Amino acid sequence: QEKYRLVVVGGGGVGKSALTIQFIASYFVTDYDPTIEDSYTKQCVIDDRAARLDILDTAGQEEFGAMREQYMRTGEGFLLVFSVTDRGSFEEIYKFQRQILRVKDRDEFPMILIGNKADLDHQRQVTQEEGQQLARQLKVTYMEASAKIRMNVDQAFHELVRVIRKFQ
Amino acid sequence: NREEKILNREIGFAIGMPVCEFDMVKDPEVQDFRRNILNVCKEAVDLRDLNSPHSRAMYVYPPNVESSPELPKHIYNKLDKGQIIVVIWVIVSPNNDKQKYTLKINHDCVPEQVIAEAIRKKTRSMLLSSEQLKLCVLEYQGKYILKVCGCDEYFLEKYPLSQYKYIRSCIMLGRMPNLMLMAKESLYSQLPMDCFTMPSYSRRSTKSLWVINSALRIKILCATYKIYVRTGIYHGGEPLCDNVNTQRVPCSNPRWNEWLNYDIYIPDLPRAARLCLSICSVKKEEHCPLAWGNINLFDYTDTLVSGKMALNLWPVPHGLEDLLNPIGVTGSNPNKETPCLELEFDWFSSVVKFPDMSVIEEHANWSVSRELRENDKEQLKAISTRDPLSEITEQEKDFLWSHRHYCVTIPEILPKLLLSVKWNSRDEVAQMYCLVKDWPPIKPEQAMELLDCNYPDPMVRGFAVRCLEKYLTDDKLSQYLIQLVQVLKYEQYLDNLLVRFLLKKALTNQRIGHFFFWHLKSEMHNKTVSQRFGLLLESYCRACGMYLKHLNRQVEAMEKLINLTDILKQEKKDETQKVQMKFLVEQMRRPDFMDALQGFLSPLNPAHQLGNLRLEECRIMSSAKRPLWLNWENPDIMSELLFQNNEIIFKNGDDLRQDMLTLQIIRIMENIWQNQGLDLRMLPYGCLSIGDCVGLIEVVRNSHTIMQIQCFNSHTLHQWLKDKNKGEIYDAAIDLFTRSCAGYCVATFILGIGDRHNSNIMVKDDGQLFHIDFGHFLDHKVPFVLTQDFLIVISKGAQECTKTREFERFQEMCYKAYLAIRQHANLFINLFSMMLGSGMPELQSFDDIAYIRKTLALDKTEQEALEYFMKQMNDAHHGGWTT
Ligand SMILES: Nc1nc2c(ncn2[C@@H]2O[C@H](COP(=O)(O)OP(=O)(O)NP(=O)(O)O)[C@@H](O)[C@H]2O)c(=O)[nH]1
Ligand SMILES: CC(C)n1ncnc1-c1cn2c(n1)-c1ccc(O[C@@H](C)C(N)=O)cc1OCC2
Ligand SMILES: [Mg+2]
């Protein structure tokens, strides 16, 4: 129908698992289950046509890094996500952006920079201005999100499928 | 009787002959077989229906697991901290949507524990009210099962996850075990409740032998169709008395009327006493046999033979040495046109019956009533370590018999002790019966030796069966099923313990019962075993359950492939360009032939479903007899994770029985190496012989022969492995090329396969080496010669000197693999002696199996046998394997 294999890459504990199930189950989770590789599917019609969204919640433990070179070959849409309360993930997002372009041997590829845990303003270490800084540096679109309050959860995946069609 | 009119139809299709050919048999043993063998069926179908849903599912889908849960040290090291990364697949949406759930778990976890972990992968921290406990605790109960993605194997039993061969193979190959999650109702709803339907024929002085005190006297009356008759009394292959023959009467006068007086005492005839008859012609000396016959002196009711009898003789084989054939069939020829020899046995005016065990153990007292140093006991241990073909001298015979009451300490010497007993003695056969009655249990692989032609005694064979049903696992049973089916011919009666054992186990494990049928239908082209296997297949199909439906589809599918190859060989075959692809593609596109090869289980593997055909790849080979390269689809919804092109070679002309024995020993040789630390990856692909000479060959994807890899001629084999395995994968592909080469080189030297060329050796893109087409083995009228292209790949990339540190370690792998097989020489030699009755060209006499004794150097010590291999390797490779 409309093949769209979405991939959620990022560091550890940045919120890839909470944001992924928020898009389908629409419920925020509080456990810290270190994800390895989980797949989710959801039919959406928010786009101008149908969409077979194949979401892949990837790992961020650095012990499953050999699995990065796999889903970066089959996916057509990525989400560079990080936690605004963790500068470590912020200074490690570009490493994900370099491996994707190196695998596919392309100048650019549809991906959206997501800043998660925006509700924890009392513990934010990466301000908003530093977020759009990496957006212009990586030539991607920046968008803050928060799985705890479900902010820009649908817009994050829907803006990703809009760059895939505008890629071609 | 209305239901029996339907079941009897489909039963005759799978057997290849109508059921009415058995109801018109005047033989009382045949009718008593069909009547009493139903007790095995009733005890089996009532075992498949104890538990209502699971017992039937366990039968159709038995857990294909290893024989031991203990993991080898090097196999356990392949796990991440002793844990396995398995992938759980769950279907959520009714539109067939997929959701994977990877999880790290211990390797020794039961399927109930991995299900509960997948439950956590579906809930995390979700909703639970104080009235919703059992709403979610019911998930942790018996609700879900597990299934391999791509195959039809199920994790129904509570065995550790490592025991399952699929999970075990993923640890070896280093692959992701993808398992699809199902519910119990999703599987149980496809198995009906087959009530046991018994057929219509299931309706409801006599002194002893040891009181006769006379001499055995058998008279030959006349015959039909200078010659004489060679008569002999044998117990398997050993003769009881001197061969007594009749007078040399001229031809065209088949009259004798002579009571052949034998030197055997009537109370001394063992229970397995046999009469061997043959006709020899006299034309220096002129003695040549022509026809032979065998009759057992006791029938199936333990009564002595009496009265007149008409025996129909058999034609002599291509290569027969002795005039009389002791290794007979113990039956008359059902050709009703061959020479028929008439006899007349002694009367005694009473029904002479063989005594029961009560009198045998009673007379065992009369033998004793009628009237230990350490250096001696160490010799009996040196006898058990010898191969079963090692000639036991006469001095060693009395040593084991005089120390018969000590052999209970070393029960592995039992096969050696049984050959040290004069079975023509009513006293020794009575004392040996009491020793076997209380004999300690032995290994199942050692008990199979007591089921070949050398041990025809029923008390000896009954002991080996009781060692199988108590110690033989279903993994080793399916491994050794070909040899166990083969030794059914050595049974002198239809109903026996070995048949009741292999029937009940095949009726309780459908994975075993599948190959139990095809190994019996493949012998139907030979009438000497057609009656035994026909009655046995009739009993199997009577209670095999729903699988009879799928089993008849394979027969119709396979029969639709035999006739096409016959039309392509006997007819046409003149041109091989358009004619090879005209009639071939016209039949595969024919409507009545398409549905014949659609939606039926693979005969090579019942868990593989052969679905839609792909005629674009289906072709006819340019090899011998022009085999058919076929292609199918995997109708499994998870076909993307497993293979998608089921490729099978249909070899019509060439016999595929030599391949099965070689492809099986390679698997057994690999298991012996993996259990000792030798990680020599062998590739024993599937092979199943069908009928006369047709058969199926499992094809491995992305595999190319040595001749298939070339770019003039050069050593491009190393470049092909470099081009396909770049980066850090090159160092692993070269290792796979060396470990598989050392295994396939040290094994063919023990077997003695024919001269292997570049088309006999194939390699994968992964770098694994394996041989194919084992048509000639144990031949003599070396096979794996270390060519230059091998050392260019084995010894790293040294374009000059091949004897480096890499090749120095290649020899050590062969030494550890050669000596390992030598330590299990008794196991492999027993596997060849159990296949001697299969009529194979290279498996006719014991001079062929003795070739294994010389290539293993079983007459030398451990170090002296090592230099033998190094000598023969340095001789085949001129200056290659120096000391
Ligand atoms: N306050 C808050 N916490 C969040 C948010 N998103 C995720 N978390 C929390 O962050 C923790 C770990 O994130 P998780 O949901 O496991 O995402 P992940 O990045 O896939 N984890 P891993 O890479 O370790 O598998 C959890 O405690 C989760 O509740 C958010 O928007 N706000
Ligand atoms: C001669 C022959 C029909 N044969 N005879 C007795 N056993 C075999 C036999 C056994 N195998 C094979 N043939 C085999 C052939 C070809 C092959 O790939 C093809 C594409 C190729 N030309 O590279 C893959 C194979 O793998 C399975 C093992
Ligand atoms: Mg995660």
Author numbering:
A (entry chain B): 12 to 179
B (entry chain A): 107 to 310, 323 to 343, 353 to 410, 416 to 503, 523 to 862, 872 to 941, 952 to 1053
Manuscript excerpt for this entry:
RAS proteins cycle between inactive GDP-bound and active GTP-bound states. Mutations in RAS and PI3Kα are major drivers of human cancer. Their interaction plays a crucial role in activating PI3Kα and amplifying the PI3K-AKT-mTOR pathway. Active RAS interaction with p110α, along with phosphorylated receptor tyrosine kinases (RTK) interaction with p85, activates PI3Kα, allowing it to modify its lipid substrate, phosphatidylinositol-4,5-bisphosphate (PIP2), to phosphatidylinositol 3,4,5-trisphosphate (PIP3).
Since RRAS2 binds p110α with the highest affinity among the three RAS GTPases, we used the structure of RRAS2-p110α complex for detailed analysis. Interactions between RAS and p110α-RBD involve two sets of p110α residues: D203 to K210 and K227 to M232. The first set, comprising D203, K204, Q205, K206, Y207, T208, and K210, located on the rβ2-strand of p110α-RBD, engages with residues on the β2-strand and switch-I of RAS. Specifically, p110α residues K206 and T208 form H-bond and salt-bridge interactions with RRAS2 residues E48 and S50, respectively. Additionally, D203 and K210 at the ends of this set form salt-bridges with R63 and E74 in the interswitch and switch-II regions of RRAS2, respectively. The second set of p110α residues, from K227 to M232, located at the end of the rα1-helix and beginning of the rα1-rα2 loop, interacts with residues within and around switch-I region of RAS proteins (S28-D49 in RRAS2). Key interactions include K227, which forms salt-bridge and H-bond interactions with D44 and D49 of RRAS2 and H-bond interactions with D33 in KRAS and P44 (main chain) in MRAS. Structural analysis of the RRAS2-p110α complex indicates that the large, polar side chain of glutamine at position 36 in RRAS2 likely disrupts interactions with the rα1-helix residues (S231 and M232) of p110α-RBD. Replacing glutamine with the smaller, non-polar alanine alleviates these unfavorable interactions, likely leading to the two-fold increase in binding affinity for RRAS2-Q36A compared to WT-RRAS2. Overall, our mutational analysis highlighted the significant roles of the D42, D49, and Y51 residues from switch-I and M78 from switch-II in the RRAS2-p110α interaction, with all four residues conserved in RRAS2, MRAS, and KRAS.
